[PDB]
Amino acid sequence: DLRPRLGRLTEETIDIAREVLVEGKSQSDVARERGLSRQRVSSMVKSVVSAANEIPREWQRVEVWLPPNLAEKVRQMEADAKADVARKNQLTDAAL
Template sequence: MQPTQPKYTAEQWTASLPALRGMSTKTLDIARAVLVEGKEPIEVANEIGQSRQLVHAAIKRVTAVLERQTVGLVPVMVWLTPEEAEQVKQMAAKHEQPKEAQPGTTKKTPNRQKKA
């Protein structure tokens, strides 16, 4: 199987690791195989003995973080007083994804059927 075109270079991936530090090694390894090495998700799923859905979920979680960097946002981890932390949270809120766009929060709507 022909590998797909990688979305990120190894250098971009390495530079993004601080933003990904809260994710598991397994998630990062899966995403790296697809996004940097250009492997197909089904190939990665077969290699690690997991479902294709698990691979896609890992890619989606990592991509959500990486896409924030493409719009000029940077992760910050600092120690602050509770009051200062609240101020920073308020500043960061405008950059958060809307609830319906966050991974794992799909909204089910009823089927709309036409009346005969």
């Protein structure tokens, strides 16, 4: 029933996230310090990062260099995908 993402996460997950984001601690250090896999801490951080950008969880960040011709298309490629997602949340529940 649409629970906002940052509200679903545990208090602990938000803590590990804070150590990495707010406090600049390394993910692997936080992982060892908390007896978790490093894969969990990376997955944890992505959850908070993705939701703070109003981004679907499955989306992957990409950092490439491109010609300005190709560059602008991928910048518009995002805006279109971003726009589509906003519309999808907007009318998918209504269209059914």
